[PDB]
Amino acid sequence: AMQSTSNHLWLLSDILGQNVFRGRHKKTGDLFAIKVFVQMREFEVLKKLNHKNIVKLFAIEEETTTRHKVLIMEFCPCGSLYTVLEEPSNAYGLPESEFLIVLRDVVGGMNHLRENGIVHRDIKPGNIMRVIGEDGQSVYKLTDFGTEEYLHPDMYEDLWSIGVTFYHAATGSLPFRPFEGPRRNKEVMYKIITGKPSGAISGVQKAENGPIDWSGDMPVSCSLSRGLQVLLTPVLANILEADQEKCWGFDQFFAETSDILHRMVIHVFSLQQMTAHKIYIHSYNTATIFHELVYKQTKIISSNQELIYEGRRLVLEPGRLAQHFPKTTEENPIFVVSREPLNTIGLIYEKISLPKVHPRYDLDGDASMAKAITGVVCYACRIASTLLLYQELMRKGIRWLIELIKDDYNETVHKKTEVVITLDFCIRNIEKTVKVELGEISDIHTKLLRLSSSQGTIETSLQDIDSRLSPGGSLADAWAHQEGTHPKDRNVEKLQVLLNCMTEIYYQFKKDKAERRLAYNEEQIHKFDKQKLYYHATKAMTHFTDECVKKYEAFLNKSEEWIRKMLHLRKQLLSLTNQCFDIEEEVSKYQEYTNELQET
Numbered sequence: 272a273m274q275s276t277s278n279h280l281w282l283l284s285d286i287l288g289q290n291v292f293r294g295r296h297k298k299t300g301d302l303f304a305i306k307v308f309v310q311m312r313e314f315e316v317l318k319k320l321n322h323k324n325i326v327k328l329f330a331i332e333e334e335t336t337t338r339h340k341v342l343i344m345e346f347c348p349c350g351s352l353y354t355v356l357e358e359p360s361n362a363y364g365l366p367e368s369e370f371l372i373v374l375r376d377v378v379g380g381m382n383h384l385r386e387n388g389i390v391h392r393d394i395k396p397g398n399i400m401r402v403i404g405e406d407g408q409s410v411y412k413l414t415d416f417g418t419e420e421y422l423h424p425d426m427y428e429d430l431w432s433i434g435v436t437f438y439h440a441a442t443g444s445l446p447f448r449p450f451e452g453p454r455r456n457k458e459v460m461y462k463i464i465t466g467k468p469s470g471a472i473s474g475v476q477k478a479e480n481g482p483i484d485w486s487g488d489m490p491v492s493c494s495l496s497r498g499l500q501v502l503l504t505p506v507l508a509n510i511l512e513a514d515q516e517k518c519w520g521f522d523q524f525f526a527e528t529s530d531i532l533h534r535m536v537i538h539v540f541s542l543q544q545m546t547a548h549k550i551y552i553h554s555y556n557t558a559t560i561f562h563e564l565v566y567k568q569t570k571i572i573s574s575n576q577e578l579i580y581e582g583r584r585l586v587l588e589p590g591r592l593a594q595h596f597p598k599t600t601e602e603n604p605i606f607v608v609s610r611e612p613l614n615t616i617g618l619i620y621e622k623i624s625l626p627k628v629h630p631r632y633d634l635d636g637d638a639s640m641a642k643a644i645t646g647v648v649c650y651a652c653r654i655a656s657t658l659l660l661y662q663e664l665m666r667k668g669i670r671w672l673i674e675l676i677k678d679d680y681n682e683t684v685h686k687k688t689e690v691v692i693t694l695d696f697c698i699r700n701i702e703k704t705v706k707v708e709l710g711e712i713s714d715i716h717t718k719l720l721r722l723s724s725s726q727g728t729i730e731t732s733l734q735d736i737d738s739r740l741s742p743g744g745s746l747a748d749a750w751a752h753q754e755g756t757h758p759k760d761r762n763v764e765k766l767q768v769l770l771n772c773m774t775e776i777y778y779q780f781k782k783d784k785a786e787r788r789l790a791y792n793e794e795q796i797h798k799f800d801k802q803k804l805y806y807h808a809t810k811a812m813t814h815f816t817d818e819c820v821k822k823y824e825a826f827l828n829k830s831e832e833w834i835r836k837m838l839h840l841r842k843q844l845l846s847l848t849n850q851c852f853d854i855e856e857e858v859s860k861y862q863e864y865t866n867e868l869q870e871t
């Protein structure tokens with residue numbers, strides 16, 4: 272039993288959205304999204320609507336048995352944005368690149384709809400479908416053109432649900448949540464929106480009939496980079512208040528969003544702070560503004576920013592455009608160091624624990640619980656891989672920094688030889704004439720011998736530093752390989768195994784919730800795997816805090832000491848080379864003084 276048309280057919284079991292059925296064409300076999308329910312104009316005008324971010328309405332037919340108006344639309348095997356947000360890997364926010372894709376498609380689609388003049392208003396993650404492009408990345412489209420959670424305070428009685436959708440995608444949770452959720456606390460919801468704190472974007476009621484925790488910045492669990500949060504906070508803040516006097520409008524919205532989308536990414540890893548950062552800078556900006564953003568994200572003075580890339584010093588000309596910078600990834604960034612002592616902070620993340628498991632056999636409660644806990648383990652896996660990444664970037668940055676310091680030492684050796692050759696060829700060229708009026712030479716020797724003495728002290732204090740830049744010389748990078756975690760331990764994948772187990776159990780509970788009840792056998796399987804879920808999560812957190820976190824903190828403290836040692840050595844070597852330059856010119860005051868007398 273199924274429904275058919277002149278060109279398409281569909282089964283009622285393959286139901287998509289509740290109606291829209293997953294159908295096929297009678298002559299080609301290609302799958303289509305079949306929609307089964309003045310019109311003949313407003314639909315044919317929707318036929319011509321062609322865009323990358325718009326679900327192409329293919330045709331309009333009439334069903335066989337009921338003669339209903341059936342819409343032949345494009346099929347999207349992946350689902351909607353809401354389906355993507357239901358996965359545990361996005362329970363605390365989408366990945367950064369995926370978020371940029373969502374923003375680009377949403378803006379690029381709504382701009383086309385405004386060029387054609389179609390207001391959507393009800394724009395939720397359920398109205399944004401996701402397909403797979405020919406390149407592999409996702410492509411999001413609009414289709415159905417409000418919802419109880421995405422309504423405007425005045426409509427609750429256009430740029431609002433867009434902001435709520437962007438916050439939901441960036442943080443994994445809704446911006447305005449009462450205690451018992453937007454259900455019986457619905458009035459609180461209204462009181463939360465009419466509280467319009469202007470700039471703030473978040474308000475969480477963490478107690479029944481309690482207060483509302485307001486916030487203007489994104490939560491710590493947000494997986495976006497700090498720079499992307501800096502550029503994203505005002506865009507949401509200015510489109511989330513009931514005042515039409517203080518609303519941006521689509522012109523300012525599209526302008527600022529287009530400003531964000533046109534910025535290339537520069538990966539910069541603060542080594543002395545052990546903190547990774549992404550600088551969003553246009554391709555036409557100069558390196559001065561780049562140092563400005565690096566300062567605004569790391570508090571490092573622009574003139575003190577010394578950059579390292581691929582094992583070499585990197586000098587950025589203040590006028591060099593950003594698009595001509597070397598291409599950098601998350602695993603091959605541009606290390607920034609400074610001569611000023613910097614505090615060793617490390618990674619900042621939200622420390623979440625395991626929510627307790629309930630014994631009540633509840634097909635809905637076990638589903639929501641499994642979703643929450645699996646999202647927690649996903650966050651623990653993300654932070655685990657991020658800590659491993661910070662440790663490896665730390666090892667590469669240190670192993671490069673020691674070689675850079677040794678290069679500076681080698682240049683100091685060059686200048687030292689330049690001073691020694693002149694010192695000898697000027698202290699003995701005078702003794703050539705002495706062995707043939709006495710104060711003019713005695714003073715010279717009493718100064719040149721001082722020069723050779725202090726120069727010798729520089730030699731000893733230099734060979735001491737070369738002894739410090741040797742293996743095991745109270746400055747070797749050997750402890751970094753023998754402290755924190757490594758990809759050899761395979762901790763990220765060790766957590767990802769239990770993550771796949773808990774994800775399979777979660778999906779099976781998602782299938783068990785659709786069924787209103789289970790048989791006895793399937794019930795006992797549901798309970799057994801419900802306990803195995805708790806065992807998997809407990810083992811995962813045990814392996815996370817008692818192996819990844821401890822090693823990371825040991826490596827971090829050790830790094831905090833080695834940073835002090837390295838800064839000390841850098842100041843010493845700088846002082847020594849400076850004591851090699853000012854005496855390089857002090858021997859220039861004597862090489863031309865008496866060695867060249869005046870006589871016809």
Ligand SMILES: CC(C)c1ccc2oc3nc(N)c(C(=O)Nc4nnn[nH]4)cc3c(=O)c2c1
Nearest residue numbers: 287288291304326344345346347348349350414
């Ligand atoms: C249940 C999930 C796995 C899934 C898989 C494929 C899907 O494939 C779709 N392909 C479309 N073209 C539209 C659509 O155009 N509009 C629409 N339906 N419901 N809400 N919006 C919707 C869907 C789905 O739901 C869907 C879900």
